[PDB]
Ligand binder design. Structure first.
Ligand SMILES: CCCCCCCCCCCCCCCCCC(=O)OC[C@H](COP(=O)([O-])OCC(O)COP(=O)([O-])OC[C@@H](COC(=O)CCCCCCCCCCCCCCCCC)OC(=O)CCCCCCCCCCCCCCCCC)OC(=O)CCCCCCCCCCCCCCCCC
Ligand SMILES: CCCCCCCCCCCCCCCCCC(=O)OC[C@H](COP(=O)([O-])OCC(O)COP(=O)([O-])OC[C@@H](COC(=O)CCCCCCCCCCCCCCCCC)OC(=O)CCCCCCCCCCCCCCCCC)OC(=O)CCCCCCCCCCCCCCCCC
Ligand SMILES: CCCCCCCCCCCCCCCCCC(=O)OC[C@H](COP(=O)([O-])OCC(O)COP(=O)([O-])OC[C@@H](COC(=O)CCCCCCCCCCCCCCCCC)OC(=O)CCCCCCCCCCCCCCCCC)OC(=O)CCCCCCCCCCCCCCCCC
Ligand SMILES: CCCCCCCCCCCCCCCCCC(=O)OC[C@H](COP(=O)([O-])OCC[N+](C)(C)C)OC(=O)CCCCCCCCCCCCCCCCC
Ligand SMILES: CCCCCCCC/C=C\CCCCCCCC(=O)OC[C@H](COP(=O)(O)OCCN)OC(=O)CCCCCCC/C=C\CCCCCCCC
Ligand SMILES: CCCCCCCC/C=C\CCCCCCCC(=O)O[C@H](COC(=O)CCCCCCC/C=C/CCCCCCCC)COP(=O)(O)OCCN
Ligand SMILES: CCCCCCCCCCCCCCCCCC(=O)OC[C@H](COP(=O)(O)OCCN)OC(=O)CCCCCCCCCCCCCCCCC
Ligand SMILES: *P(=O)(O)OCC(C)(C)[C@H](O)C(=O)NCCC(=O)NCCSC(=O)CCCCCCCCCCCCC
Lengths: 87, 104, 55, 128, 67, 459, 178, 80, 102, 125, 110
């Protein structure tokens, strides 16, 4: 019924959420932008980003895996792997 | 097993068990289809007290309402022919005590 | 109509920027009166325990 | 400040409210590491067997075998007629029998006495 | 009919469903008004409720206290 | 009855002279033919039994049991085909010979007209069952199971032999017709109490009765599939048939001696159902369910009313069929995974749909779903017990609730859930197994359609 | 679920999990988005106020008090995502998940109904059977003499190898198998 | 096909309860960084919604007109 | 925490293998190879499914069920004053003259 | 619901009537000439109409007429409004007669209380 | 009969809402459906009006008569009071469903 997800759509949506975040400069934001190394965030900000992704995609990321997603590309890979997206 | 961690990668995801680990003596009782000992938002004593108080109060008030019934300011319903003596199964051979209803 | 008005008032009070912890009555009503908890944990545990320990 | 949560048998204490979860000694960390090591060893053995391509059958679980053996075939050899066991067995095996015997005997005696006195409504009772 | 999904936008509606919903709401309200016009007794009562305090001792058969 | 007896004694030489690869085919075909022949015994009269000769007679109680035995033999043959692939030709022929001898002894026991011949054959059934269990069982406990079974039965039945010879000396004959027509009341004295105890205790140990029942789990768990099928379906009904036959000469003392056994049977229903609630072995669960149903039959026979005997007979037939089907399903699951633990294999509805359907039907028949003959018998027994006293209704209600609980519990545990990941030898169900389940289940529904054939002689 | 657990949760992990739980329960209480944003900002203000604390004993005491406050003030019926454990759609499709070992019990006619799929399946089976020895050798080379100390598996060091114990992870059933 | 995400720069918290929340947080000394990600919900076709009383009276306007016409027609038929 | 290099590399390899597995799980255009082997619909549905059961049941009731006594029992029709009994050509008379109540 | 419940339960239950035991006084007590109620529908007519035993009250003739009207004009179920109104008015008159009986019982009880209190006062002095 | 009618309709409307929002069964996530789903909103409003006893809907010809019969009967006063409170609470939870499901701003995923 619902249209299937794709890698490009997942990347677009996660970058959309990150660009809507007010503590991230959209011009310096890319899929390889580390949240703490080159974006200057901290643990609480990373937790809030993970929660925003959970709200965006309508599913919960366990805390054991959420503490390791430090890149938009990593978030995309996790979502695609969980949703069984291969294209 | 309900208390056990759901996000761990168990060898038996439905039973939430691992291969080789010791099995509780009462695993047959503590499966997720049966008795649950998971923590509750409200203490067990408080829940029991509230439930018992509610049911006891309801029973007491039902008894009070039974001994203090509610009705309307009307007389008994009046039926013809000796309060329908024959219609309710009265013996035709015997003659019932007459029941007479007057206008008012 | 009384129920309509009271429910509508209490639902409109949810837009206020005020947060308060729940009441005992709210916890009793939301938890289904605590009946499923007590009556689904205690009798089942006792029956399944006497089925193994005694019989 | 806030009312305290009182744990029970069926309402066990949550892991975040356990006082021992905040008083950690260096020995506790060693115990946790040992537990993790045991779990990892068991997991490795199970995963090797599970991912073996030539395996065709059921991976026998020694823990499951021990549980089934202990619950069924290991009870009597480890039974000693202590006073507790004697009293519990006598009660739970004899008391219900005499209770039901007394109840049924009383009921049947009352019914028989009523029948003998001829004051029991037995009309339309032609199927017994 | 094919409806394209929307992202962060109001969904695409249909004239048929709009007119059907409006028609059925109007039908319900018309039925309520029409029934209340003809059968207002079913809601407001039909016969007056007597006042027991206005009944006379003569018609109730109550003799004067002296007897 | 010779038209049924002789074909079994011809099954023996046919089995021993058939080719090595044709033994199963010949045995199954001719067992089915013998069952078809034995179907003619259902044409019973309304007043007196069918007296073929001075030795054999058939009644409305004997006929359904004979039909059940003759129908059960080929199913046991199919199960033996299942689990005896690698056996040698001579040992397979010996197994078939044991089954045939057991069937012949059961037929003669059910059609015997005298109590002493009935006792001789009813004790003769012990040897083939003991040999089958202790020889073709799979685990170590088969020897202990055989010892328990044999010694429980013999300790029960020897005082029965003493009582029977005493009764013959006192009265003149042990012929059932004579002891029924020439029956006289039994006085309330110690000697009569002990004679009553001898006979009843023999048949109750055979039944079994609660407290005298450990041999039943021991033997049924450790026996092979055919042994379990014959132990649960027919051999348990020897006690009920004997009690329904021997109680003719025990009145009115039965009105006074029935209390301990009635209380034992009802509390045993409760206790065995509760045990079924917490069993880690599937065969043990089925065995304890059998114990509960036989306790209900005991209650019916002891209260001894015309509405209780019909219910007793219907429940005996229905329980035999249902227990045989349950044991067959459990044996299929065991042969797939080589373990009797119930929680070992799950997701069997995902892996095997048709077997899930068979499990559903068998579990529904076990919990007495109307209008099945299981429910018919249970309801008649419950009504008779209610007439007897008005707390038996409470006991029967709680027993019925627990029965439904454990039946659906075993169904949900075995069939529903997530399949075990490391069990990758679940092959598709065989046509033989599917046909076995169908042949178990269809006669139950046909007897539901026509229930007057299994309601005994008091119908 | 994809990550091997550690022996224990550090203080940072404990406080982060408490923060996420508190935010989720606050969202459950504050249904509307603006109210939730206001109170979530207040909650993060509290956390940032307590963020800088050199005394670990005092930090642990604050964490314990915060956990007690959360347990007292938690939502009795918190929001749960439908697919998450305890959700209304949790484990809904577990009955539709059938494995490839079931798939290889098919009849030849059924297999002939899908000719192209089973060629690739045979290729996958050969690939699995040609790597098991290398996988077990790599696993036994890298383990300490006592044994594994964690549930983390090594990757494939060589170019022609595959990460050990990959078959079931790769060939697990799809989240919507039917 | 290939649904395209709208431009992200169009999401502003002005004219929204979110701006009131931002004013309150600024008064308290704080800030709300997720304003726009929630501000998508307060614009477009979602900007205005009816009240509870207005929802119950969804089709009263046409129902009343139909009732008036029906009453007039019935009276006319009764007269003639 | 974060991804160690070993964990990241293993995850990358597993993702590659999983995506290739799913791509293989796709089907071919030819893949399902089957063996070689409305007024009309509503009319053919109405004759059988409705007309045959009603015929069978009417035949069973009119000639088998009603051939035995008391199998089909009908509650007797209500007789009101001022009526005509059709069986015997009878006239059930009217009631009394009602006293006016206004 | 009503003030009579409050009067009986929080006042003088002796002066308030008992619904399950009334009437207590003789029907002719205070009525020099009282007319017996008249039943129009006969027992045979009610039996033939198969009225329910609760419906065989003194208002049964209007119910019979309503049933006959409804049966005759079956397809047009919006027909017997006049018969329905007549039956409802007859039931209303029966109910107001019951209310009159209740009020008569109440004031007879209070008159008895006044008389006995006056007698007690006379006996005392 | 009347309850069968309007309760089946209410359950169908709830199922339509759940299916449209990707198996979401939480009113805390439902919102904006008054204009998002016109026909479902109309049907649910009509069903809730019938459930609470709108003076000329299906629920009026049963619930109103039931309440009138309970009032004019020799019954338990506590039972009568509880029946009235139950009717008020029925109106209350109908209001809760409507308010949290159809009125307000969206709370579902983008
Ligand atoms: C052992 C006891 C046994 C009792 C047996 C008898 C039971 C009787 C029940 C009586 C009715 C109960 C009503 C609901 C109570 C629960 C409310 C709730 O949980 O709301 C949350 C829920 C919303 O929750 P949420 O949106 O998820 O958010 C929750 C908040 O975050 C957080 O929520 P919150 O907790 O902040 O909000 C709750 C708050 C606000 O809710 C209310 O005030 C609800 C009641 C409204 C007023 C009702 C009375 C006034 C109107 C009638 C006046 C008299 C009229 C007389 C004449 C009538 C005829 C003309 O209420 C309270 O704090 C206390 C309420 C006490 C109610 C009395 C019964 C329980 C007493 C228990 C003892 C302890 C009390 C203190 C609390 C615990 C300790 C701290 O509310 C609703 O959905 C609406 C609730 C109100 C509906 C009212 C409908 C009408 C009620 C009947 C009126 C009369 C009708 C005619 C009767 C017959 C006349 C002849
Ligand atoms: C021991 C505690 C005890 O007496 O429990 C009674 C209780 C039965 O409840 P009850 O109805 O209250 O007892 C009989 C009435 O008090 C009184 O009943 P009544 O007044 O209706 O008279 C009937 C009484 C007439 O009284 C006599 O006949 C007294 C003379 C008895 C002579 C010795 C009999 C030897 C054979 C017994 C079975 C051996 C196996 O019958 C008996 O005494 C029959 C005794 C044997 C019953 C069947 C036992 C089967 C095995 C049970 C599980 C064993 C493990 O449990 C047993 O009888 C089984 C106890 C197992 C240990
Ligand atoms: C007779 C049926 C015996 C059981 C089925 C055996 C065959 C089979 O596997 O069928 C499934 C299978 C369905 O096809 P499939 O999708 O390939 O199978 C996959 C699944 O197995 C498909 O399985 P499924 O789960 O989709 O459904 C299979 C079905 C199969 O399960 C059943 O049929 C179970 C029925 C018995 C339940 C337990 C016993 C309770 C007592 C009932 C006694 C009634 C006796 C009536 C007379 C029966 C005479 C035979 O199970 C159910 O429908 C679930 C249980 C339904 C219970 C309904 C209520 C029962 C209590 C009330 C009954 C009242 C009746 C009398 C009313 C009196 C007043 C008017 O059937 C066939 O393929 C039929 C073809 C061959 C049929 C035989 C030859 C026919 C032509 C001659
Ligand atoms: C006489 C000719 C009339 C004109 C032509 C009519 C159409 C042609 C066919 C002949 C029809 C004859 C009249 C039949 C009833 C017509 C409707 C009517 O009068 O309604 C009155 C009433 C309506 O009257 P009312 O009460 O609303 O009127 C109120 C009038 N005012 C407001 C002015 C006071 O409606 C009904 O009785 C409802 C009928 C429902 C029928 C449901 C479908 C049945 C389907 C049966 C299928 C199976 C058939 C085979 C069975 C045997 C097995 C095989
Ligand atoms: C068990 C322990 C108790 C039983 C031990 C058996 C040893 C015999 C003790 C009882 C003997 C009874 C007896 O001899 O008299 C019975 C009577 C004697 O009367 P007469 O002398 O012939 O004439 C009347 C004189 N005025 O003879 C009979 O009735 C025939 C039947 C008696 C057989 C003996 C009864 C045996 C007891 C049966 C209990 C069965 C227990 C079953 C064990 C099950 C174990 C799993
Ligand atoms: C007045 C109201 C009574 C309400 C009853 C409520 C239920 C309480 C009764 C049953 C509870 C269990 C009592 C019997 C079980 C024995 C208890 C026990 O095990 O004690 C032993 C030691 O044995 C004793 O102490 C015996 C004390 C009690 C003896 C009671 C009298 C003995 C009764 C003799 C009759 C036995 C047969 C009864 C059935 C016969 C047929 C009816 C050791 O206990 P521990 O578990 O190790 O330590 C725990 C400390 N809290
Ligand atoms: C909140 C509740 C507030 C009121 C609580 C009152 C508790 C006491 C109470 O109800 O007393 C009423 C009393 C009960 O007495 P009762 O048990 O009926 O005695 C008859 C003997 N078989 O009643 C009496 O003694 C007389 C009752 C008169 C009315 C009976 C109507 C039928
Ligand atoms: P990030 O990696 O940048 O690092 C942040 C952390 C917090 C890990 C720091 O590095 C750190 O460890 N700092 C010192 C330790 C510390 O801060 N301890 C105290 C923090 S816990 C605390 O203060 C919480 C109190 C407020 C929240 C209480 C929650 C109760 C509300 C429950 C409501 C539920 C329903 C509404």
């Amino acid at each position: 019924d619902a249209p299937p997800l794709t890698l490009e759509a997942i990347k677009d949506r996660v970058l959309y959420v990150l660009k809507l975040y007010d503590k991230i400069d959209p011009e310096k934001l890319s899929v390889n932008s580390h949240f703490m190394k080159d974006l200057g965030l901290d643990s609480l900000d990373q937790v809030e980003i993970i929660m925003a992704m959970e709200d965006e995609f309508g599913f919960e990321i366990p805390d054991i895996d959420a503490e390791k997603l430090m890149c938009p590309q990593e978030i995309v890979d996790y979502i695609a792997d969980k949703k069984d997206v291969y294209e | 097993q309900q208390e056990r961690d759901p996000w761990y990668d168990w060898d038996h995801p439905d039973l939430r068990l691992n291969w080789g680990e010791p099995i509780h003596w009462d695993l047959d009782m503590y499966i997720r289809n049966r008795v649950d000992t998971s923590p509750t938002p409200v203490s067990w004593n408080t829940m029991c007290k509230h439930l018992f108080g509610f049911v006891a109060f309801m029973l007491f008030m039902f008894w009070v309402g039974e001994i203090y019934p509610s009705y309307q300011p009307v007389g008994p319903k009046q039926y013809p022919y000796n309060d329908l003596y024959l219609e309710r199964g009265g013996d035709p051979t015997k003659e019932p005590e007459p029941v007479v209803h007057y206008e008012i | 109509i009384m129920g309509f008005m009271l429910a509508l008032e209490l639902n409109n009070t949810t837009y206020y920027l005020k947060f308060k912890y729940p009441s005992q009555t709210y916890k009793f009503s939301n938890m289904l009166g605590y009946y499923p908890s007590i009556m689904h944990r205690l009798p089942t545990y006792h029956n399944l325990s006497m089925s193994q320990k005694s019989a | 400040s806030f009312p305290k949560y009182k744990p029970s048998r069926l309402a066990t204490l949550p892991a975040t409210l356990d006082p021992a979860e905040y008083d950690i000694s260096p020995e506790t960390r060693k115990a946790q590491a040992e537990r993790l090591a045991i779990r990892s060893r068991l997991k490795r053995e199970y995963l090797l067997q599970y991912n073996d391509p030539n395996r065709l059958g059921v991976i026998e679980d020694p823990a499951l075998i021990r549980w089934t053996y202990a619950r069924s075939a290991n009870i009597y050899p480890n039974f000693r007629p202590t006073p507790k066991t004697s009293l519990l067995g006598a009660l739970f095996g004899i008391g219900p029998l005499f209770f039901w015997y007394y109840v049924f005997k009383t009921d049947r005696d009352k019914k028989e006495k009523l029948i003998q006195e001829g004051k029991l409504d037995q009309t339309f009772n032609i199927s017994y | 009919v094919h409806i394209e999904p929307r992202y962060r936008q109001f969904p695409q509606l249909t004239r048929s469903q709009l007119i059907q919903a409006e028609f059925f709401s109007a039908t319900m309200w018309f039925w309520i008004l029409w029934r209340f016009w003809h059968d207002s007794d079913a809601v407001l009562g039909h016969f007056p409720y007597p006042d027991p305090s206005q009944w006379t001792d003569e018609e109730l058969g109550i003799l004067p206290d002296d007897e | 009855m010779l038209k049924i007896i002789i074909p079994t004694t011809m099954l023996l030489p046919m089995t021993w002279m058939s080719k090595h690869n044709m033994i199963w085919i010949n045995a199954t075909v001719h067992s089915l033919l013998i069952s078809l022949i034995s179907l003619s015994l259902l044409n019973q009269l309304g007043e007196n039994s069918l007296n073929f000769s001075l030795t054999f007679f058939s009644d409305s109680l004997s006929a359904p049991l004979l039909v059940l035995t003759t129908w059960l033999l080929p199913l046991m043959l199919m199960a033996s085909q299942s689990h005896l692939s690698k056996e040698t030709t001579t040992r397979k022929k010996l197994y078939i010979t044991m089954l045939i001898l057991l069937q012949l002894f059961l037929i003669m026991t059910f059609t015997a007209t005298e109590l002493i011949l009935f006792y001789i054959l009813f004790e003769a059934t012990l040897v083939p069952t003991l040999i089958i269990i202790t020889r073709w069982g799979n685990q170590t406990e088969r020897l202990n199971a055989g010892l328990y079974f044999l010694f429980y039965t013999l300790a029960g039945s020897l005082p029965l032999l003493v009582a029977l010879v005493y009764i013959q000396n006192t009265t003149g004959s042990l012929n059932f017709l004579i002891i029924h027509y020439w029956s006289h009341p039994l006085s309330n004295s110690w000697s009569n109490i002990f004679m009553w105890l001898a006979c009843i205790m023999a048949f109750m140990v055979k039944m079994p009765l609660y407290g005298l029942h450990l041999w039943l789990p021991k033997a049924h768990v450790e026996a092979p599939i055919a042994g379990s099928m014959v132990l649960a379906a027919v051999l348990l009904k020897l006690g009920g048939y004997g009690m329904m036959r021997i109680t003719t000469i025990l009145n009115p003392l039965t009105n006074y001696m029935a209390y301990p056994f009635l209380m034992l049977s009802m509390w045993g229903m409760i206790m065995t159902s509760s045990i079924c609630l917490r069993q880690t072995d599937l065969k043990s669960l089925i065995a304890y369910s059998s114990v509960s149903h036989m306790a209900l039959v005991i209650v019916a026979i002891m209260i001894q009313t015309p509405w209780s005997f019909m219910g007793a007979t219907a429940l005996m037939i229905a329980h035999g069929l249902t227990s045989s089907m349950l044991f067959c399903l459990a044996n299929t699951n065991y042969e797939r995974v080589h373990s009797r633990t119930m929680i070992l294999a799950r997701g069997l509805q995902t892996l095997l749909p048709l077997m899930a359907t068979w499990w559903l039907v068998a579990s529904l028949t076990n919990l007495a779903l109307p209008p099945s003959i299981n429910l018919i018998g249970e309801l008649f027994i419950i009504t008779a017990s209610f007439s007897w006293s008005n707390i038996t209704i409470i006991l029967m209600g709680m027993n019925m609730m627990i029965t439904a609980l454990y039946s659906l519990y075993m169904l949900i545990t075995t069939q529903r859930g997530k399949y075990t990941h490391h069990i990758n030898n679940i092959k598709p169900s065989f046509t033989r197994e599917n046909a076995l389940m169908a042949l178990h289940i269809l006669p139950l529904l046909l007897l539901t359609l026509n229930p007057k054939m299994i309601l005994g002689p008091l119908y | 679920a994809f990550s091997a657990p550690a022996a224990y949760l550090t203080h940072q992990q404990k406080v982060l999990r408490l923060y996420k739980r508190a935010l989720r329960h606050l969202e459950s209480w504050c249904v509307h988005r603006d109210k939730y944003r206001y109170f979530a900002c207040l909650m993060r203000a509290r956390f940032d106020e307590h963020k800088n604390e050199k005394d670990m004993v005092k930090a642990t005491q604050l964490l314990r008090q915060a956990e007690e406050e959360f347990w007292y003030g938690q939502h009795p019926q918190p929001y749960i995502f439908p697919e998450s454990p305890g959700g209304t759609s949790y484990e809904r499709y577990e009955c539709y998940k059938v494995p490839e070992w079931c798939l290889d019990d098919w009849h030849p006619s059924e297999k002939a109904m899908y000719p192209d799929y089973f060629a690739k399946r045979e290729q996958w089976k050969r690939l699995r059977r040609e790597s098991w020895e290398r996988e077990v050798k790599q696993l036994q080379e890298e383990t300490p003499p006592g044994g594994p100390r964690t549930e983390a598996l090594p990757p494939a060091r060589k170019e022609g190898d595959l990460p050990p114990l990959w078959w079931h992870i790769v060939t697990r059933p799809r989240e919507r198998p039917m | 096909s290939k649904m395209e995400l709208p431009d992200y720069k169009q999401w502003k918290i002005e004219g929204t309860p979110l701006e009131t929340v931002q004013e309150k947080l600024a008064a308290r000394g704080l800030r709300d960084p997720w304003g726009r990600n929630e501000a998508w919900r307060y614009s477009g076709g979602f900007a205005n919604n009816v009240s509870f009383v207005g929802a119950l009276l969804k089709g009263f306007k046409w129902g009343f007109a139909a009732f008036v016409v029906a009453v007039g027609a019935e009276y006319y038929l009764e007269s003639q | 925490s974060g991804y160690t290099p070993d964990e990241k590399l293993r995850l990358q390899q597993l993702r590659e293998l999983r995506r290739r597995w799913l791509k293989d799980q796709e089907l071919s255009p030819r893949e399902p190879v089957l063996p070689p082997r409305k007024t009309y619909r509503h009319s053919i549905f109405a004759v059988t499914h409705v007309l045959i059961p009603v015929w069978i049941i009417h035949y069973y009731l009119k000639y088998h069920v009603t051939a035995k006594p008391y199998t089909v029992v009908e509650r007797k029709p209500r007789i009101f004053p001022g009526d005509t009994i059709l069986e015997t050509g009878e006239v059930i008379p009217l009631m009394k003259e009602f006293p006016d109540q206004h | 619901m009503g003030a009579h419940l409050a009067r009986r339960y929080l006042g003088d239950a002796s002066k308030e009537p008992d619904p399950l035991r009334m009437p207590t006084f003789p029907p002719d007590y205070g009525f020099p000439e009282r007319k017996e109620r008249e039943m129009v529908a006969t027992q045979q007519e009610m039996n033939d109409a198969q009225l329910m035993l609760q419906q065989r009250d003194y208002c049964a003739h209007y119910l019979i007429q309503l049933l006959k009207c409804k049966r005759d004009s079956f397809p047009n179920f919006l027909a017997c409004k006049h018969e329905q109104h007549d039956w409802d008015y007859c039931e209303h008159l029966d109910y107001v007669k019951r209310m009159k009986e209740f009020e008569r019982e109440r004031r007879l009880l209070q008159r008895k209380k006044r008389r006995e209190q006056r007698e007690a006062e006379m006996a005392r002095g | 009969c009347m309850h069968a009618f309007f309760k089946a309709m209410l359950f169908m409307c709830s199922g339509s809402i759940i299916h449209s929002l990707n198996d979401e069964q939480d009113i805390r996530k439902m919102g904006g459906l008054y204009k998002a789903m016109p026909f479902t909103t109309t049907a649910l409003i009509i069903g809730s009006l019938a459930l609470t006893g709108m003076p000329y809907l299906t629920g009026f010809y049963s619930k109103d008569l039931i309440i009138e019969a309970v009032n004019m009967s020799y019954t338990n006063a506590w039972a009568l009071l509880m029946t009235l409170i139950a009717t008020s609470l029925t109106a209350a939870y109908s209001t809760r469903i409507i308010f949290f499901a159809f009125l307000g701003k969206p709370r579902f995923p983008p």
